[PDB]
Structure formats: C-alpha cells, structure tokens
Structure 1
C-alpha cells in the first residue's frame, strides 16, 4: 500500500479504487485531472474523497474534479477543506463562489488571499464581495488581489479610473501585470496622436493585458502611419487575449496579404480582431489558395470563415471535412461555409458530420434544418440539445419540430431550448400565453433571459398589456423589457 510503486502504477491503482462511491470517476475524468493536477492530484482526490463529499463540505464529484484539475490541484483540495467553511460562514460567500476561486492554477494562494484581503477590500466604500470573488477567480488571483489593494488608490486618484474599471482590468489572467502596466503607460499612450484613456482601459481589460499594452505602445506609430491602420483598428486587434501576437502578425502579413488583388487592410483587421487572430491570419496565408482550388471556395468565403474566433480551427476543419460533408451527407460548399463561419465553427462542423444522420432519420429533420441549427455560435451545443429535447418538447409540451428548430436556430439555442422546457408550463397555464407566443419569444438570440424576464414581470409586476409585453420581448428581449422599466 505505502510503497515505491512508479507513477503510472500508482495512478492506475487509485483509478481501480475510484470505480465506486462516493467518488466514482472514470479514466476520462482521471485523465482530465492528471493533465494538469498530475498523479499528485489524483492521489489527493483518492485520499480525501470522503471528507470532500461528506458534510459539512458536500462537494459534488463534478466540483471535486474541477478543483483537482489544475496545477497545484492537491494544494487547492487541501485548502478548500480548510477555508470553504470559513469563507462561507464568516464572510457569506456561497460554496459555488469558493469553488470558483479554488478552480484555477494556484487555487490555494487565491483562497488564502481572499481570506486575508476580503476584510480589507470590503470595508465601507470599498469593493463588493462579488468583485473580490471575480478578481480572485483567475490564475494568479492572489497576485491580482494584492495589486488591486496596492494600486486602487493611485489608479483612481492620479489616473481618474473608476473602481469598476480597475476591477475590470484586474479580472483577467495576469491581472497584476495589466494593472501595473496601465499605471505605467497611461500617460505615455494618452497624448495627441495616441490613444484615449477609454481605449487603454479596453485593451487592459480584454485579455491581452500587459503584452498587448506594451505592443501597442511599440507598434502604434508604424501600424498607423506606414501600415495605414486607424488607432481604432489597432485597438480592436489589441483587445483580445494574445493581442500582442495578432498585432505583430498584422505588422508582418499586411505587406504580404494586401498586394494587388489580395486582401484589403480591412479584411486583415477583421481576421486579426479575434482571439487567436495570429493563428487565423497565418492559416489564411497557408490555406486560401488550396481551399479555393481544391474545394471550390472563393477568397471572400475563406475570409468569412477566418473572421471568427478559432478561425484557424474552422479553416482546417473545412479543408478536412468539406469533401466528406458534400459527398456523404449531400451538403453544398455554401452550406459548409455557413456552418464554419461562427465561433466554434470546427465544433459545429464535426457535430453536423456526426449527428446529421441521426437527426434526419430518427427525429425526422431535413438536412436544411440541421444546417440552420448548426449555423450559429455554439452550433454544437444547439445540435446536441435538439437531439436530446426534441422528443420531450414535441410529446410533453406539444410543440412541432419546426418550432423546436426555430427555437434552436440562434446563438444560445441550447439555453433557449432548455428554458422553453422549464418555463412553457407556467407561461401558458399561469399567465395565459400560448405555446406559439412562448416560441416567438424564445426564437431570438437571448431567448433564455427574454423568457426569464417575462415570467418575472408576469409574476411580480411594477400599465402595459401582456400582449404588449410579449411583443416587446420578441422585439428586444430582456433589454427591451428593462428599457420599459426605466420609463
């Protein structure tokens, strides 16, 4: 038992012993933990399983896995056992919040720092607990929290930022570095022919952090003069994680991609202005000719695919799957492009390849309906949810397949479907809506909160007729309903 067994041997032994309660974990979940937490975390999960799952902690297996699967995972598991009770009982944090803080590399450090600093940050006229939890819920959360403590005063007093803007900058991986760099570079960047303070805060708040701010300082003059970009365009490229990489790649590839009958600067900016913009741009360079020759695409289509986050993944997946999808599944290049042209296009394409037969045969949808569901951000999520909920929505709530498809065919389709499942009964039976009206409300981006907002208004109102509320919900969803409140 106690022994000098090798690393894999130790891992597999623990795996053997984790087949059952309270912590039943498959090799997959064990792989997830091990990639980051290592065999160390797996052994820690094994050692502490009963206390983690038992009272007063009451963590689900899902929460335990989430804490364990990070660098230092063993340390975070030990620390949550000690500090969760403390943070919840003495500071009124929820377990969800504590788990959120714990589930990042170095979670031990973040938890101990929230314990130490929450009392000083949340004094009168200070931060809310929610803001502290948000800052802490990233890798290096300890560093970000200590740096907010230090620099909140100078950033607000000397540089004129609001505490909310400071929290926004701090609430990213490498937040400490972003805060220190804003402090240093604000005066430099914000001069005539420079940036606005708003643009500096945006770059510092959007993921790209210190590196993006430093690269804009470095490259703004040459990008805006020799390369002819606007400061707005430069800020758009800078305002994602990896902004530095996209900026440098634009510098290098603008001369290459914008020659006669190539791309325009505006096309290049659109490709670069997403997370992974460097990868998207390099992949466009590599694959534009071959996608156009081999699969009959046009440059405009290639650019369209590339102009979303994960553009590299979508282009490579089009290269790989367009033939399979057209030949075996009967889709057209246009339909394949349509599915590919959203964030997560790779995920949607692979899910269409996998689920299209099942959806057309067993559930009776047409390929066109499947394409329609797939052709939105999170298309994979919406396709899988249609597969899951179509029969129950049609049988128990009496919807038609066409109505289910309409609910699903928008960004957040998964959320809207699940919310229709939840709320259709109360909306119809308690407030006299028809399923038609519920479907109409749900059949837009932001379908979920539109439904939630209308159920809430119909339950405890602050007028406007119910049909008028429904029309507003359809027109503008939750934001429409909230606009009416302020009237």
Structure 2
C-alpha cells in the first residue's frame, strides 16, 4: 500500500499481486508494459484490472496489456474505461476499434479526439467511421484527425486528391506532418522534371512522410542527374518509412558501391527500397568483403540477402550463424542464403537453428523440407506453426506430412495452416471437396483468403462449377473469385 518505495520495488510489488485473476501477467507482459508505459502503467493496470476485465467493458488480458504498453499507458487505460462505452453505444464503434485507437502512444488524446471529431468528420459526404478509426490508430492520432479536418477540403478542391488519398496520407505515424507537407510541396514537386501527383501521394502514404517528401524535394535533381537514377527509382527509395535516411545513404554510397566491378545503381536502389534501407546499404558496405571471404558467399548472394527489409539483421545473422547451420546442422551456404533472403530472414535463421532438430527427429521431416518452409517471408511463423499443428493435421484431419509442408511453404504459411485446420471439415463434409483440393488451394501465397473466399462462395453463391471455382481459387485465390463476380453478376 501507500509508501515512498523505490521504482523497482514498487514494480515488483505490483507484479506480485498481478500473478492471478482476472489478469495473470507474466514476466514478458510485465517487462513489455515497463519498457513503454512504465511502472506508472503497471500500477494503473493493477488499480483498474477488475473494472477493465469486468462488465460492461469485458476487455481481455491481451487487450489490457496492449493498451497499457505505450507511453501514457495509464492515461489511455483511464480514458478507455470512460470512452469505450460512449464510442460503442453512441457511435456504433466496436470494442476492437476502440482498443485499436487506444493502443498507441498518447492513446487518451486519440480517443478524446475521435469522440469530438467523429460527429463532424462523419457527416453526409464525409469520411466513414472506418476511415476515422484508421486515421486515429497511430501515434499522434489526435494531430492527424485535426489536420484531416483542416486540410481535407483544400487537398481535395485545390489539389484534386480524393478523400481516399487524403486518408491514406493521414493514416501513418506523423500523419499531420505528411498532410501539411503534401499541401506545401505538391506545387513544387509536380512540375516538368519533377514527380507526378500520384508519386507524391505514394511517398506521403508509405510511411516516410514529411521527411521523405522534403528529402526528395532536396535531392531529386542531384540523384537524377549526377547520380543517374530515374525519378521512379528515387520514388521507390522514398516510398518507405525512413525514406529520408535511405535517400541520403544512396546519395553518399552510390559513388562507393558503384565502382569498377562493384554494384550497379539498380542493385543499390534494390537494397535501399526497403524499411531500413539505410541500415541495409551500410551493412552491405561493411560485410560484403567478409561474407565473401570467410563464409564463401558471392557478392550476388550478399545483395540478394540485403535486398529485403531487415537486410541488416539478415546479413549480420548470416555472418553469425552460417557456420553452425552448415556444420552443426549440415546445411549448405546456398540454403542459408535462401533462408536469409526474405523479410525476417534473421528470425527464419534463428528458428531453423532452434527447431530443425525437433522437426527432423520427432516429426520426421527432412532438413530439405525444413529449409523449404523457412525460405519464405514469415518463415519463423511457418516453422513454429508446423511444429504446433503437424500432429493434429495429420492425426485428426488425415493429411500427410508432405501436404502439411506444401501448405506451409509459401508466404503466410502460418495463416494457411491455421485456416486449413479451421475449414477442411466444412469444405470436405459439406461441399464435397477433397483434402487434396483444399491442400491445392491453401498451397499458395494468399492461401487463407483463397480458402475463406471459396467457403464463402460455396456456402451462399452468386455460375461456374465447383471444380472450376477450385481451379480459379488455385490460380488466383480470393482476387480470382472476386474478379469473376465482376462478370457473372
């Protein structure tokens, strides 16, 4: 109770009583809250756990941790208890939407601003509630909402943006800055020898915001002339968060990396056109000679690994783990590169290192299969999900390990496996598909929505044959099923 106990002691005391219901927090969730919301947020969570989880709020422990774990966490926790009922009962927002709004730094501010501005933004011929929630669901959500309120009319009338484009620009961290900068720089950027309005909107909408736009304004002429890049390549580099950083890094490193038998400008653009393109470029500069000597990789492979987001993390992890993977696990350098060459390459590699024994011994997969699974984006998720669901998919649903590996071996493998698990019985028992056909559908990128679109059109239809529908689902997934509505209708 009431004392001047020190910070850590205060924390561990609050944590002590937070081990059981309604909210049993672990060390992980505790640390998570501490790192952003602080001991303040931990104390808030303690103080309010019963009200937060009880009626009529009924928030889960996960939702509570999600709100608590940001700067101003206590403020957001206090504010949602007030405003969730209001926003839900008076404005028809879902609790999920309200929690989404609250789960950012300064969430209190965003929630209060949605309360105030939702009635003025969502009048006739205005924004949809969904658009308002999207805009509010970022740090500085209040600033973004007030700025859309202000500049929506001039951006649409004077510059001819659609409301949808204005929302796209606004729906990022620093959205207020992106909107004001678009409004200022459109005229200057969109002249002969500049960018198209479409390109400026892309830059403003992809997360690099104000910084990326100002840096393009500044560096376009020299990057396009002295550095020989096309405007399109400059826009590609700028069209990520931290675009400014990547652009300045390309300006600095182009005359380094593009020397005799170095990289091409196109290779440099490729490396830089990812989140953290700066880190990826600098790491290529630093590690290309050593990965090629020590670990036997080629410059082409190094560029391949660098050419995704998490480039730096993947390159450093290859440098660190290629030996053990090759020796303690008998993989080849080409296999390690294949696992590394995706978003999350680092995670994929560490998960292969951790999980390859249990999967090959206890589950009887081949290292080749494990590598196949790991060699996509989200590879870590796919590995862990195969570990989790292999036995239930094979035992209860009658699949072969080969089929499970097939479902797992694309981007979104986790989602595909979980969806197959959900929907295999209804597709087979109610609509007469085979497990082979379900597996066929699931075994592509976009497997999950392909399966959901097919169970949708099969449960209540608007016609091609079922086999034709399965064939379309395999060929182009959900988009194929939707694009055939745009005809038969």
| Cα drift, residue 207 of structure 1 | 0.2
Please list the CA deviations of residues 431-464 of structure 1 after superposition, one character each: whole Å capped at 9, or x if unmatched.
0000000000000000000000000111110120
> Which residue is 1:314 aligned to?
314
| Cα drift, residue 379 of structure 1 | 0.1
Could you say what secondary structure the match of 1:260 adopts?
coil
> Which residue is 1:34 aligned to?
34
Please list the CA deviations of residues 15-68 of structure 1 after superposition, one character each: whole Å capped at 9, or x if unmatched.
111111111111221100000101000000001111001100001000000000
- 1:138-157 paired onto structure 2 within 5 Å: 138-157=138-157
> Which residue is 2:334 aligned to?
334
Please list the CA deviations of residues 51-101 of structure 1 after superposition, one character each: whole Å capped at 9, or x if unmatched.
001100001000000000000000000000000000000000000000000
| Cα drift, residue 142 of structure 1 | 0.1
Are 1:379 and 2:382 an aligned pair? no
**Alpha-carbon distance in 1 for matches of 2:160, 2:31:** 47
**Alpha-carbon distance in 1 for matches of 2:27, 2:372:** 36
Could you say what secondary structure the match of 2:52 adopts?
helix
**Alpha-carbon distance in 1 for matches of 2:221, 2:92:** 49
> Which residue is 1:449 aligned to?
449
| Cα drift, residue 292 of structure 1 | 0.1
- 1:386-465 paired onto structure 2 within 5 Å: 386-465=386-465
**Alpha-carbon distance in 1 for matches of 2:17, 2:89:** 33
**Alpha-carbon distance in 2 for matches of 1:108, 1:114:** 10
Could you say what secondary structure the match of 2:328 adopts?
helix
| Cα drift, residue 218 of structure 1 | 0.0
**Alpha-carbon distance in 2 for matches of 1:149, 1:265:** 42
> Which residue is 2:99 aligned to?
99
**Alpha-carbon distance in 2 for matches of 1:48, 1:367:** 49
**Alpha-carbon distance in 2 for matches of 1:125, 1:464:** 38
**Alpha-carbon distance in 1 for matches of 2:397, 2:284:** 46
**Alpha-carbon distance in 2 for matches of 1:317, 1:224:** 34
> Which residue is 1:79 aligned to?
79
Could you say what secondary structure the match of 1:240 adopts?
coil
Could you say what secondary structure the match of 1:432 adopts?
coil
Unaligned runs of 5+ in 1: none
| Cα drift, residue 123 of structure 1 | 0.3
**Alpha-carbon distance in 1 for matches of 2:332, 2:148:** 53
Could you say what secondary structure the match of 1:486 adopts?
helix
**Alpha-carbon distance in 1 for matches of 2:5, 2:414:** 46
**Alpha-carbon distance in 1 for matches of 2:89, 2:453:** 32
**Alpha-carbon distance in 2 for matches of 1:237, 1:51:** 47
> Alignment RMSD, CA only?
0.3
Please list the CA deviations of residues 153-183 of structure 1 after superposition, one character each: whole Å capped at 9, or x if unmatched.
0000000000000000000000000000000
Please list the CA deviations of residues 336-374 of structure 1 after superposition, one character each: whole Å capped at 9, or x if unmatched.
000000000000000000000000000000000000000
**Alpha-carbon distance in 1 for matches of 2:386, 2:441:** 18
Please list the CA deviations of residues 237-277 of structure 1 after superposition, one character each: whole Å capped at 9, or x if unmatched.
00000000000000000000000000000000000000000
Equivalent residue pairs, number: 487
Could you say what secondary structure the match of 2:195 adopts?
coil
**Alpha-carbon distance in 2 for matches of 1:71, 1:484:** 47
**Alpha-carbon distance in 1 for matches of 2:343, 2:153:** 39
Please list the CA deviations of residues 216-245 of structure 1 after superposition, one character each: whole Å capped at 9, or x if unmatched.
000000000000000000000000000000
Please list the CA deviations of residues 284-311 of structure 1 after superposition, one character each: whole Å capped at 9, or x if unmatched.
0000000000000000000000000000
**Alpha-carbon distance in 1 for matches of 2:241, 2:368:** 35
- 1:7-406 paired onto structure 2 within 5 Å: 7-406=7-406
**Alpha-carbon distance in 1 for matches of 2:449, 2:48:** 39
The structure 1 segments of at least 4 consecutive aligned residues displaced by more than 2 Å after TM superposition are none
**Alpha-carbon distance in 2 for matches of 1:23, 1:391:** 31
TM-score after normalising by structure 2: 0.99
Could you say what secondary structure the match of 2:452 adopts?
helix
Could you say what secondary structure the match of 2:463 adopts?
coil
| Cα drift, residue 425 of structure 1 | 0.2
